[PDB]
Design a protein around this ligand. Structure first.
Ligand code: ZN
Lengths: 45, 166, 268
Protein backbone atom coordinates (compact mmCIF):
# COMPACT_ATOMS: atom_id res chain seq x y z
CA UNK A 1 0.00 0.00 0.00
CA UNK A 2 2.68 2.49 1.06
CA UNK A 3 5.91 2.97 -0.87
CA UNK A 4 9.31 2.33 0.69
CA UNK A 5 12.90 2.11 -0.51
CA UNK A 6 15.43 -0.39 0.79
CA UNK A 7 18.40 1.30 2.43
CA UNK A 8 21.21 -0.55 0.63
CA UNK A 9 19.79 -1.92 -2.64
CA UNK A 10 17.53 1.11 -3.35
CA UNK A 11 14.63 -0.96 -4.68
CA UNK A 12 11.12 0.47 -4.47
CA UNK A 13 8.70 -1.73 -2.53
CA UNK A 14 5.05 -1.51 -1.55
CA UNK A 15 4.27 -2.57 2.01
CA UNK A 16 0.88 -3.18 3.61
CA UNK A 17 0.05 -3.39 7.31
CA UNK A 18 0.61 -7.13 7.76
CA UNK A 19 3.87 -7.22 5.78
CA UNK A 20 7.03 -7.54 7.84
CA UNK A 21 9.42 -4.64 7.26
CA UNK A 22 12.11 -6.36 5.21
CA UNK A 23 13.41 -5.95 1.68
CA UNK A 24 12.13 -8.53 -0.80
CA UNK A 25 15.22 -8.28 -3.06
CA UNK A 26 18.27 -8.07 -0.77
CA UNK A 27 16.71 -8.65 2.65
CA UNK A 28 17.99 -5.54 4.40
CA UNK A 29 15.66 -4.79 7.30
CA UNK A 30 16.19 -1.02 7.13
CA UNK A 31 13.61 0.67 4.90
CA UNK A 32 13.10 4.36 4.19
CA UNK A 33 9.71 5.94 3.62
CA UNK A 34 9.31 7.30 0.11
CA UNK A 35 9.48 11.05 -0.42
CA UNK A 36 6.05 12.64 -0.59
CA UNK A 37 4.40 13.22 -3.95
CA UNK A 38 2.93 16.59 -2.96
CA UNK A 39 4.92 19.63 -4.01
CA UNK A 40 6.54 21.50 -1.12
CA UNK A 41 7.17 25.24 -1.19
CA UNK A 42 10.39 26.92 -0.06
CA UNK A 43 11.10 30.61 0.27
CA UNK A 44 14.39 31.29 -1.51
CA UNK A 45 15.74 33.47 1.31
CA UNK B 1 6.95 -22.74 23.31
CA UNK B 2 3.76 -20.70 23.81
CA UNK B 3 5.82 -17.53 24.14
CA UNK B 4 7.68 -18.38 20.94
CA UNK B 5 4.45 -19.07 19.05
CA UNK B 6 2.70 -15.90 20.25
CA UNK B 7 5.49 -13.59 19.05
CA UNK B 8 5.44 -15.11 15.50
CA UNK B 9 8.94 -16.38 16.26
CA UNK B 10 8.08 -20.00 17.01
CA UNK B 11 10.79 -22.61 17.51
CA UNK B 12 10.24 -26.36 17.16
CA UNK B 13 9.73 -29.10 19.72
CA UNK B 14 13.29 -30.31 19.11
CA UNK B 15 14.66 -26.87 20.06
CA UNK B 16 12.88 -26.81 23.42
CA UNK B 17 13.81 -30.44 24.06
CA UNK B 18 17.42 -29.53 23.25
CA UNK B 19 17.35 -26.94 26.02
CA UNK B 20 14.89 -28.46 28.50
CA UNK B 21 15.29 -32.18 29.14
CA UNK B 22 11.61 -33.17 29.00
CA UNK B 23 9.96 -36.29 27.60
CA UNK B 24 7.90 -35.82 24.45
CA UNK B 25 4.64 -37.23 25.83
CA UNK B 26 4.48 -35.10 28.98
CA UNK B 27 5.59 -31.99 27.07
CA UNK B 28 2.85 -32.50 24.47
CA UNK B 29 0.19 -33.11 27.12
CA UNK B 30 1.36 -30.05 29.08
CA UNK B 31 1.23 -27.93 25.92
CA UNK B 32 -2.30 -29.14 25.18
CA UNK B 33 -3.50 -28.40 28.73
CA UNK B 34 -1.92 -24.94 28.75
CA UNK B 35 -3.40 -24.13 25.33
CA UNK B 36 -6.83 -25.18 26.61
CA UNK B 37 -6.61 -23.07 29.76
CA UNK B 38 -5.16 -20.14 27.78
CA UNK B 39 -8.16 -20.26 25.44
CA UNK B 40 -10.40 -20.44 28.51
CA UNK B 41 -8.74 -17.39 30.06
CA UNK B 42 -8.97 -15.52 26.75
CA UNK B 43 -12.70 -16.28 26.58
CA UNK B 44 -13.14 -15.27 30.23
CA UNK B 45 -10.98 -12.17 29.77
CA UNK B 46 -10.05 -10.29 26.60
CA UNK B 47 -10.85 -12.43 23.57
CA UNK B 48 -7.90 -12.80 21.19
CA UNK B 49 -8.20 -13.78 17.54
CA UNK B 50 -5.56 -16.41 16.76
CA UNK B 51 -5.00 -15.32 13.08
CA UNK B 52 -2.58 -18.26 12.67
CA UNK B 53 -0.38 -17.86 15.73
CA UNK B 54 -1.15 -21.23 17.38
CA UNK B 55 -0.67 -22.91 14.00
CA UNK B 56 0.76 -26.41 14.24
CA UNK B 57 2.82 -26.24 11.05
CA UNK B 58 4.29 -22.69 10.96
CA UNK B 59 6.76 -23.88 8.33
CA UNK B 60 7.31 -20.37 6.96
CA UNK B 61 9.03 -19.36 10.22
CA UNK B 62 11.51 -22.26 10.21
CA UNK B 63 12.97 -21.61 6.74
CA UNK B 64 15.13 -18.52 7.59
CA UNK B 65 16.57 -20.03 10.78
CA UNK B 66 17.26 -23.39 9.13
CA UNK B 67 18.88 -21.65 6.16
CA UNK B 68 21.00 -19.62 8.59
CA UNK B 69 22.18 -22.84 10.23
CA UNK B 70 23.40 -23.99 6.80
CA UNK B 71 24.83 -20.58 5.88
CA UNK B 72 22.73 -20.25 2.73
CA UNK B 73 22.34 -16.96 0.80
CA UNK B 74 19.04 -15.08 0.92
CA UNK B 75 17.69 -16.03 -2.51
CA UNK B 76 17.98 -19.71 -1.58
CA UNK B 77 16.01 -18.90 1.60
CA UNK B 78 13.19 -17.11 -0.25
CA UNK B 79 13.07 -19.84 -2.89
CA UNK B 80 12.78 -22.38 -0.06
CA UNK B 81 10.04 -20.28 1.55
CA UNK B 82 8.11 -20.23 -1.74
CA UNK B 83 8.66 -23.98 -2.13
CA UNK B 84 7.40 -24.65 1.40
CA UNK B 85 4.37 -22.43 0.76
CA UNK B 86 3.57 -24.33 -2.45
CA UNK B 87 4.15 -27.69 -0.71
CA UNK B 88 0.81 -27.22 1.06
CA UNK B 89 -0.94 -27.70 -2.30
CA UNK B 90 0.77 -31.09 -2.73
CA UNK B 91 -1.52 -33.60 -1.03
CA UNK B 92 1.13 -36.34 -0.96
CA UNK B 93 3.30 -34.48 1.58
CA UNK B 94 0.66 -32.36 3.35
CA UNK B 95 0.73 -34.80 6.27
CA UNK B 96 4.50 -34.55 6.71
CA UNK B 97 5.94 -32.71 9.69
CA UNK B 98 6.74 -29.05 8.94
CA UNK B 99 10.39 -29.65 9.89
CA UNK B 100 10.63 -32.31 7.19
CA UNK B 101 8.76 -30.13 4.67
CA UNK B 102 11.07 -27.19 5.40
CA UNK B 103 14.17 -29.38 5.15
CA UNK B 104 13.19 -31.01 1.86
CA UNK B 105 12.29 -27.60 0.41
CA UNK B 106 15.67 -26.23 1.53
CA UNK B 107 17.47 -29.25 0.05
CA UNK B 108 15.53 -28.95 -3.22
CA UNK B 109 16.53 -25.30 -3.51
CA UNK B 110 20.13 -26.14 -2.56
CA UNK B 111 20.24 -28.58 -5.47
CA UNK B 112 18.47 -25.98 -7.62
CA UNK B 113 21.00 -23.24 -6.79
CA UNK B 114 24.01 -25.62 -7.06
CA UNK B 115 25.07 -24.92 -3.46
CA UNK B 116 27.80 -27.47 -2.55
CA UNK B 117 26.11 -28.89 0.55
CA UNK B 118 25.40 -32.62 0.70
CA UNK B 119 22.28 -34.26 2.10
CA UNK B 120 24.41 -35.69 4.92
CA UNK B 121 25.43 -32.20 6.06
CA UNK B 122 21.82 -30.97 5.98
CA UNK B 123 20.73 -34.03 7.95
CA UNK B 124 23.52 -33.58 10.49
CA UNK B 125 22.81 -29.86 10.96
CA UNK B 126 19.02 -30.05 11.29
CA UNK B 127 18.76 -33.59 12.79
CA UNK B 128 16.60 -35.04 10.03
CA UNK B 129 17.26 -38.55 8.75
CA UNK B 130 19.05 -38.52 5.40
CA UNK B 131 16.67 -41.19 4.15
CA UNK B 132 13.75 -38.92 5.04
CA UNK B 133 15.34 -36.02 3.13
CA UNK B 134 16.06 -38.25 0.13
CA UNK B 135 12.50 -39.63 0.11
CA UNK B 136 11.09 -36.11 0.37
CA UNK B 137 13.25 -34.97 -2.54
CA UNK B 138 12.20 -38.02 -4.57
CA UNK B 139 8.49 -37.42 -3.93
CA UNK B 140 8.92 -33.71 -4.76
CA UNK B 141 10.77 -34.34 -8.04
CA UNK B 142 7.52 -34.98 -9.92
CA UNK B 143 6.15 -31.54 -8.96
CA UNK B 144 9.24 -29.52 -9.95
CA UNK B 145 7.27 -26.95 -11.96
CA UNK B 146 4.94 -25.87 -9.15
CA UNK B 147 7.51 -25.76 -6.34
CA UNK B 148 10.20 -23.71 -8.11
CA UNK B 149 9.50 -19.97 -8.27
CA UNK B 150 8.54 -19.13 -11.89
CA UNK B 151 10.14 -15.68 -11.75
CA UNK B 152 13.48 -17.20 -10.71
CA UNK B 153 13.63 -19.47 -13.75
CA UNK B 154 12.24 -16.59 -15.84
CA UNK B 155 15.18 -14.40 -14.79
CA UNK B 156 17.53 -17.29 -15.55
CA UNK B 157 19.29 -17.44 -12.18
CA UNK B 158 18.26 -21.11 -11.85
CA UNK B 159 17.15 -23.83 -14.24
CA UNK B 160 15.14 -27.00 -13.70
CA UNK B 161 17.77 -29.32 -15.22
CA UNK B 162 20.12 -28.64 -12.29
CA UNK B 163 18.03 -30.93 -10.09
CA UNK B 164 19.38 -34.51 -10.28
CA UNK B 165 16.86 -37.17 -11.20
CA UNK B 166 15.81 -40.23 -9.24
CA UNK C 1 59.03 -42.90 53.12
CA UNK C 2 56.88 -41.57 55.95
CA UNK C 3 58.03 -42.68 59.40
CA UNK C 4 57.52 -41.70 63.03
CA UNK C 5 60.09 -39.47 64.68
CA UNK C 6 61.87 -39.79 68.04
CA UNK C 7 61.62 -43.58 68.06
CA UNK C 8 63.33 -45.08 71.12
CA UNK C 9 62.32 -48.66 70.25
CA UNK C 10 65.12 -48.93 67.62
CA UNK C 11 62.57 -49.88 64.97
CA UNK C 12 64.79 -48.42 62.23
CA UNK C 13 67.14 -51.42 62.50
CA UNK C 14 64.42 -53.86 61.41
CA UNK C 15 62.72 -51.72 58.75
CA UNK C 16 65.81 -49.98 57.28
CA UNK C 17 68.81 -52.11 56.32
CA UNK C 18 70.90 -49.06 55.38
CA UNK C 19 72.59 -47.09 58.15
CA UNK C 20 71.05 -43.73 59.05
CA UNK C 21 74.41 -42.06 59.77
CA UNK C 22 75.75 -39.44 57.38
CA UNK C 23 78.55 -40.63 55.11
CA UNK C 24 81.53 -38.28 55.40
CA UNK C 25 84.37 -40.10 53.59
CA UNK C 26 83.56 -38.24 50.35
CA UNK C 27 83.70 -34.80 52.02
CA UNK C 28 87.39 -34.37 51.12
CA UNK C 29 86.56 -34.22 47.40
CA UNK C 30 86.95 -30.82 45.75
CA UNK C 31 83.78 -29.50 44.09
CA UNK C 32 83.64 -26.49 41.77
CA UNK C 33 80.30 -24.65 41.89
CA UNK C 34 79.81 -23.51 38.29
CA UNK C 35 77.12 -21.18 36.95
CA UNK C 36 76.29 -21.79 33.29
CA UNK C 37 74.55 -19.76 30.55
CA UNK C 38 71.18 -20.80 29.13
CA UNK C 39 72.48 -23.13 26.40
CA UNK C 40 75.07 -25.00 28.46
CA UNK C 41 72.60 -25.45 31.32
CA UNK C 42 69.99 -26.63 28.82
CA UNK C 43 72.30 -29.21 27.23
CA UNK C 44 74.02 -30.17 30.51
CA UNK C 45 70.90 -31.00 32.56
CA UNK C 46 68.64 -32.96 30.18
CA UNK C 47 67.85 -36.57 31.04
CA UNK C 48 67.78 -37.85 27.44
CA UNK C 49 71.48 -36.87 27.26
CA UNK C 50 74.49 -37.15 29.63
CA UNK C 51 75.19 -40.88 29.41
CA UNK C 52 78.55 -40.47 31.15
CA UNK C 53 80.38 -39.41 27.98
CA UNK C 54 83.10 -36.78 28.03
CA UNK C 55 81.86 -33.25 27.34
CA UNK C 56 85.13 -31.30 27.30
CA UNK C 57 88.50 -30.65 28.88
CA UNK C 58 89.66 -28.14 31.49
CA UNK C 59 92.88 -26.21 30.81
CA UNK C 60 94.42 -24.41 33.79
CA UNK C 61 97.16 -22.02 32.71
CA UNK C 62 99.33 -21.53 35.80
CA UNK C 63 100.78 -18.17 34.74
CA UNK C 64 97.72 -16.41 36.16
CA UNK C 65 95.50 -19.39 37.07
CA UNK C 66 93.41 -18.81 33.94
CA UNK C 67 90.82 -21.58 33.50
CA UNK C 68 89.40 -22.44 30.08
CA UNK C 69 86.96 -25.07 28.84
CA UNK C 70 87.68 -26.81 25.53
CA UNK C 71 84.41 -28.53 24.63
CA UNK C 72 84.27 -31.56 22.36
CA UNK C 73 82.70 -31.41 18.91
CA UNK C 74 80.20 -34.21 19.63
CA UNK C 75 77.47 -31.86 20.91
CA UNK C 76 76.92 -29.20 18.22
CA UNK C 77 78.79 -27.07 15.68
CA UNK C 78 76.94 -23.75 15.88
CA UNK C 79 77.83 -23.32 19.57
CA UNK C 80 81.34 -22.28 20.68
CA UNK C 81 83.67 -24.84 22.20
CA UNK C 82 86.14 -22.53 23.97
CA UNK C 83 84.96 -20.90 27.20
CA UNK C 84 86.46 -18.95 30.10
CA UNK C 85 85.80 -20.18 33.65
CA UNK C 86 85.95 -16.99 35.70
CA UNK C 87 86.43 -17.43 39.45
CA UNK C 88 84.54 -14.85 41.48
CA UNK C 89 85.90 -16.34 44.73
CA UNK C 90 89.22 -18.17 45.00
CA UNK C 91 88.24 -19.43 48.48
CA UNK C 92 84.58 -20.22 49.18
CA UNK C 93 83.71 -20.78 52.83
CA UNK C 94 80.78 -22.60 54.47
CA UNK C 95 79.63 -24.25 51.22
CA UNK C 96 79.41 -28.02 50.76
CA UNK C 97 77.49 -30.54 48.64
CA UNK C 98 75.22 -33.12 50.25
CA UNK C 99 73.20 -35.83 48.51
CA UNK C 100 70.09 -37.69 49.65
CA UNK C 101 69.34 -41.35 48.93
CA UNK C 102 66.07 -43.12 49.73
CA UNK C 103 66.13 -45.94 52.27
CA UNK C 104 65.21 -49.60 51.78
CA UNK C 105 61.93 -50.32 53.58
CA UNK C 106 62.06 -54.04 52.73
CA UNK C 107 63.53 -56.53 55.27
CA UNK C 108 64.17 -28.24 79.30
CA UNK C 109 64.65 -31.93 80.15
CA UNK C 110 61.04 -32.68 79.13
CA UNK C 111 60.86 -34.72 75.93
CA UNK C 112 58.14 -35.99 73.59
CA UNK C 113 58.73 -39.26 71.63
CA UNK C 114 57.10 -37.91 68.46
CA UNK C 115 58.70 -35.26 66.23
CA UNK C 116 57.74 -36.51 62.71
CA UNK C 117 61.27 -37.07 61.40
CA UNK C 118 61.60 -38.35 57.83
CA UNK C 119 64.67 -40.66 57.72
CA UNK C 120 66.74 -40.21 54.56
CA UNK C 121 70.26 -41.33 53.71
CA UNK C 122 72.60 -38.34 53.56
CA UNK C 123 76.18 -38.07 52.33
CA UNK C 124 78.50 -35.10 51.82
CA UNK C 125 79.68 -35.27 48.21
CA UNK C 126 82.55 -32.85 48.80
CA UNK C 127 83.75 -29.36 49.72
CA UNK C 128 83.15 -26.28 47.56
CA UNK C 129 85.99 -23.75 47.46
CA UNK C 130 85.57 -22.24 43.96
CA UNK C 131 82.50 -20.38 42.70
CA UNK C 132 82.76 -20.54 38.91
CA UNK C 133 81.01 -18.87 36.00
CA UNK C 134 81.39 -19.90 32.35
CA UNK C 135 81.56 -17.08 29.78
CA UNK C 136 81.81 -17.68 26.03
CA UNK C 137 85.16 -16.60 24.64
CA UNK C 138 85.46 -13.37 22.68
CA UNK C 139 87.64 -14.79 19.90
CA UNK C 140 85.41 -17.75 19.02
CA UNK C 141 83.75 -17.51 15.58
CA UNK C 142 80.60 -19.05 17.11
CA UNK C 143 80.46 -16.45 19.92
CA UNK C 144 78.20 -14.21 17.82
CA UNK C 145 75.99 -17.29 17.39
CA UNK C 146 75.39 -17.01 21.13
CA UNK C 147 74.79 -13.25 21.08
CA UNK C 148 72.25 -13.38 18.24
CA UNK C 149 70.65 -16.28 20.11
CA UNK C 150 70.54 -13.98 23.12
CA UNK C 151 69.12 -11.37 20.75
CA UNK C 152 66.68 -14.12 19.76
CA UNK C 153 65.67 -14.38 23.43
CA UNK C 154 64.15 -10.88 23.56
CA UNK C 155 62.85 -10.95 19.98
CA UNK C 156 60.54 -13.97 19.76
CA UNK C 157 57.04 -13.94 21.26
CA UNK C 158 55.85 -16.98 23.22
CA UNK C 159 52.16 -16.10 22.78
CA UNK C 160 50.10 -16.40 19.60
CA UNK C 161 47.26 -14.13 18.58
CA UNK C 162 43.59 -15.03 18.87
CA UNK C 163 42.06 -17.07 16.05
CA UNK C 164 39.32 -15.40 14.01
CA UNK C 165 36.54 -17.59 12.63
CA UNK C 166 36.41 -16.66 8.94
CA UNK C 167 33.38 -18.76 7.92
CA UNK C 168 29.73 -17.68 7.82
CA UNK C 169 28.48 -16.55 11.22
CA UNK C 170 25.30 -18.62 10.89
CA UNK C 171 27.35 -21.82 10.66
CA UNK C 172 29.15 -20.81 13.86
CA UNK C 173 25.88 -19.99 15.65
CA UNK C 174 24.21 -23.21 14.46
CA UNK C 175 25.50 -25.03 17.56
CA UNK C 176 24.60 -22.24 20.00
CA UNK C 177 21.58 -22.22 22.28
CA UNK C 178 18.56 -23.16 20.22
CA UNK C 179 19.77 -25.97 17.97
CA UNK C 180 18.23 -29.09 16.50
CA UNK C 181 21.45 -30.94 17.40
CA UNK C 182 20.72 -32.95 20.53
CA UNK C 183 23.71 -33.46 22.81
CA UNK C 184 25.45 -36.79 22.18
CA UNK C 185 28.16 -36.49 24.84
CA UNK C 186 28.05 -38.81 27.85
CA UNK C 187 29.65 -36.37 30.31
CA UNK C 188 27.76 -36.32 33.65
CA UNK C 189 24.77 -38.34 32.49
CA UNK C 190 23.82 -38.94 36.11
CA UNK C 191 20.13 -39.28 35.27
CA UNK C 192 21.02 -41.86 32.63
CA UNK C 193 22.99 -44.07 35.03
CA UNK C 194 20.70 -43.70 38.07
CA UNK C 195 17.12 -43.80 36.73
CA UNK C 196 17.71 -47.06 34.83
CA UNK C 197 17.65 -49.13 38.05
CA UNK C 198 14.07 -50.27 38.71
CA UNK C 199 13.05 -52.80 41.37
CA UNK C 200 10.11 -55.12 40.68
CA UNK C 201 8.78 -57.66 43.18
CA UNK C 202 5.69 -59.75 43.93
CA UNK C 203 3.55 -60.50 47.00
CA UNK C 204 5.54 -63.53 48.06
CA UNK C 205 3.86 -65.17 51.08
CA UNK C 206 4.06 -64.22 54.74
CA UNK C 207 5.80 -67.26 56.26
CA UNK C 208 8.81 -67.13 53.93
CA UNK C 209 9.24 -63.37 54.29
CA UNK C 210 9.07 -63.57 58.10
CA UNK C 211 11.63 -66.39 58.02
CA UNK C 212 13.83 -64.21 55.80
CA UNK C 213 13.46 -61.31 58.24
CA UNK C 214 14.43 -63.65 61.08
CA UNK C 215 17.51 -64.78 59.12
CA UNK C 216 18.60 -61.16 58.63
CA UNK C 217 17.90 -60.37 62.29
CA UNK C 218 20.04 -63.36 63.30
CA UNK C 219 22.81 -62.11 60.99
CA UNK C 220 22.61 -58.64 62.55
CA UNK C 221 20.10 -57.26 65.04
CA UNK C 222 19.80 -53.79 63.47
CA UNK C 223 18.63 -53.13 59.90
CA UNK C 224 16.88 -50.43 57.87
CA UNK C 225 14.10 -50.28 55.29
CA UNK C 226 16.38 -49.86 52.28
CA UNK C 227 18.94 -52.52 53.22
CA UNK C 228 16.29 -55.10 54.07
CA UNK C 229 14.38 -54.20 50.89
CA UNK C 230 17.44 -54.73 48.69
CA UNK C 231 18.29 -57.90 50.63
CA UNK C 232 14.88 -59.58 50.26
CA UNK C 233 13.52 -57.91 47.06
CA UNK C 234 10.02 -57.18 48.32
CA UNK C 235 7.66 -54.20 47.97
CA UNK C 236 7.71 -51.53 50.66
CA UNK C 237 4.02 -51.99 51.50
CA UNK C 238 4.40 -55.74 52.04
CA UNK C 239 7.67 -55.38 53.97
CA UNK C 240 6.18 -52.74 56.29
CA UNK C 241 3.20 -54.99 57.11
CA UNK C 242 5.60 -57.69 58.37
CA UNK C 243 8.13 -55.49 60.21
CA UNK C 244 5.75 -53.93 62.74
CA UNK C 245 4.46 -57.35 63.84
CA UNK C 246 7.88 -58.80 64.74
CA UNK C 247 10.24 -55.79 64.92
CA UNK C 248 10.31 -52.09 65.78
CA UNK C 249 12.24 -48.92 65.03
CA UNK C 250 14.55 -47.32 67.59
CA UNK C 251 13.48 -43.77 68.46
CA UNK C 252 15.98 -42.58 71.09
CA UNK C 253 18.85 -45.09 71.28
CA UNK C 254 22.31 -44.76 69.77
CA UNK C 255 21.16 -47.03 66.91
CA UNK C 256 18.06 -44.93 66.20
CA UNK C 257 16.16 -44.85 62.88
CA UNK C 258 16.95 -48.56 62.39
CA UNK C 259 14.62 -51.55 62.53
CA UNK C 260 15.59 -54.06 65.22
CA UNK C 261 14.03 -57.22 66.61
CA UNK C 262 11.50 -56.93 69.42
CA UNK C 263 12.68 -57.51 73.02
CA UNK C 264 10.29 -60.48 73.27
CA UNK C 265 12.01 -62.14 70.29
CA UNK C 266 15.44 -60.78 71.29
CA UNK C 267 16.24 -63.67 73.65
CA UNK C 268 15.21 -66.21 70.98
ZN1 ZN D 1 17.08 -4.30 -0.44
Amino acid sequence: TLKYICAECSSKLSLSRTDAVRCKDCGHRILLKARTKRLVQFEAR
Amino acid sequence: LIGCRRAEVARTFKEIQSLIHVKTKEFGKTLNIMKNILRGKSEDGFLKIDTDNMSGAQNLTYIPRFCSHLGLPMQVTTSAEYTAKKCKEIKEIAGKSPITIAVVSIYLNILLFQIPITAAKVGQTLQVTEGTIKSGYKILYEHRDKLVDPQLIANGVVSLDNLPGV
Amino acid sequence: EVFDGNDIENNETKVYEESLDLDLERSNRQVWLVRLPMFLAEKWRDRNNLHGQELGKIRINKDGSKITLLLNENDNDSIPHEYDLELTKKVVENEYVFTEQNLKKYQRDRYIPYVKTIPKKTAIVGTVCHECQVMPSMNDPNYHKIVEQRRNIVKLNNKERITTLDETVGVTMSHTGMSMRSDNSNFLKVGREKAKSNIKSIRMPKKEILDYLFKLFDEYDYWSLKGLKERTRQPEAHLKECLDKVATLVKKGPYAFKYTLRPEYKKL
